[PDB]
């Protein structure tokens, strides 16, 4: 509600709360049946075809006080299973263990599992694809006093096999 | 087995491996006559394989999956779309399956949901599925199904 | 297009039982985990309770829980809020929303209310 339109939209706080295994980001990879992904660049331009095919990567710049440490777990269910709840259930498909303290940019790329030769860029039905999840695997360290909670950017791009088909259009007054 | 002109088409044969495509045409609207407004919304489709558990409530653990596949779909985009591969059980999916254990092939579950919450203006959508079975093959080919089902 | 109204807000006084609604426009609510997040006054956004109506799996905040009740209606596809006895902190604007999910947590979520305040003041 606040938070929308304004240029916070992009920062994900890391609170200062509990090892609650509700994730701190779950993202449906269904490019048009899920508002987030179709205000990306990679998502305007599927707002021109009717579909696509190949595989989008996901990029995780974290944005806290050098000296900070710890890991999270990025995590990947792919379609049709449902998003991963509990850190266990989700640590279990496809995940990288992504250390704070190690390396600042964790990289994930999500394959191209689908059914057909080529999915959809319209809400007919929620053929729920990939879920780009995130979990706190350890929680975050921090030196002396440094501020507990730090912000996190997502950036979403296609792959070199990435390819669309056509060329529709829906342009309004 | 719910739509007819896919149905017979496949029955022209007994056997069959196919690797299936979905797409995902999301529609919605408001229900109301209110001039109340909402923001683009972003629905959640889960495909879920063959043998799982199914979602009931749609709060429950089983929804956040560890494991099984999922679609954020935002709403005003270009359709979404999955393609899952062959996953039978056996050799081929067996249309008319002989003998004793009707529990056709199982060829998985699909849950949808919005994961935004609740707007004073209730919102509907409709969720229409298409299927493209793709690098199909097929075996022993049946005389026509000539009724109705 | 999903639209979630957000309906049943108004002033309690400490100690109130009221509760919320939300309709589910586009989708069909089994296809998104359906929450609840408040906007404490001068303060950052807190996830209060949160179910997917698929099976119905019931989460509370630390807070909120015991209290209110977070049940969900697959015909008229609606969330109800018993936000039972109604506290001086949670004199708070809600907003409804659906996610994945399938609880209380800040981002996660896709489709967001409008606004309603519940003002617990005698």
């Known amino acids: 509600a606040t938070k929308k339109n304004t240029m916070e939209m992009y920062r994900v706080r890391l609170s200062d709360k509990p090892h609650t295994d509700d994730p701190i980001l779950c993202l449906s990879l269904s490019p048009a049946s899920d508002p987030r992904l179709s205000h990306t660049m990679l998502g305007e331009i599927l707002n021109y075809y009717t579909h696509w095919a190949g595989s989008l990567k996901f990029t995780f710049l974290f944005c806290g006080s050098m000296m900070a440490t710890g890991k999270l777990l990025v995590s990947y269910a792919p379609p049709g299973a449902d998003p991963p709840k509990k850190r266990k259930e989700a640590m279990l498909g496809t995940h990288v263990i992504w250390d704070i303290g190690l390396q600042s940019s964790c990289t994930m790329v999500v394959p191209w599992i689908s059914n057909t030769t080529y999915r959809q860029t319209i809400d007919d039905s929620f053929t729920e694809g990939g879920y780009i999840s995130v979990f706190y695997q350890t929680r975050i360290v921090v030196p002396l006093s440094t501020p507990r909670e730090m912000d996190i950017l997502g950036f979403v791009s296609a792959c070199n096999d990435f390819s669309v088909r056509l060329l529709r259009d829906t342009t309004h007054i | 087995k719910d739509t007819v002109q896919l149905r017979r088409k496949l029955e022209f044969f007994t056997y069959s491996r196919f690797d299936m495509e979905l797409t995902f045409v999301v529609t919605a609207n408001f229900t109301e006559t209110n001039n109340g407004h909402a923001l683009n919304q972003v629905y959640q489709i889960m495909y879920v394989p063959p043998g799982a558990p199914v979602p009931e409530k749609w709060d429950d653990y089983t929804w956040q999956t560890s494991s099984n596949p999922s679609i954020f779909y935002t709403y005003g985009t270009a359709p979404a779309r999955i393609s899952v591969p062959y996953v039978g059980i056996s050799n081929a999916y067996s249309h008319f399956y002989d003998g004793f254990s009707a529990s056709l092939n199982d060829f998985g579950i699909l849950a949808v949901r919005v994961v935004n919450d609740h707007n004073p203006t209730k919102v509907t959508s409709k969720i229409r599925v298409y299927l493209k079975p793709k690098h199909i093959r097929v075996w022993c080919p049946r005389p026509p199904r000539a009724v109705a089902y | 297009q999903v639209q979630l109204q957000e309906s049943g807000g108004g002033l309690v006084q400490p100690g109130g039982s009221l509760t919320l609604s939300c309709a589910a426009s586009?989708?069909?609510?089994?296809?998104?985990?359906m929450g609840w997040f408040r906007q404490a006054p001068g303060k950052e956004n807190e996830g209060v309770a949160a179910?997917?109506?698929?099976?119905?799996?019931?989460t509370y905040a630390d807070s909120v829980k015991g209290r209110f009740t977070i049940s969900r209606d697959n015909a008229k596809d609606t969330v109800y809020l018993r936000m039972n006895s109604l506290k001086p902190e949670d004199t708070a604007i809600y907003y409804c929303?659906?996610?994945?999910?399938?609880?209380?947590?800040?981002?996660?979520?896709?489709?967001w209310g409008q606004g309603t305040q519940v003002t617990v003041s005698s």
């Open positions: 929303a659906s996610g994945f999910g399938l609880s209380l947590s800040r981002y996660t979520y896709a489709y």
């Open positions: 586009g989708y069909a609510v089994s296809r998104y985990s």
């Open positions: 179910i997917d109506s698929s099976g119905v799996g019931t």
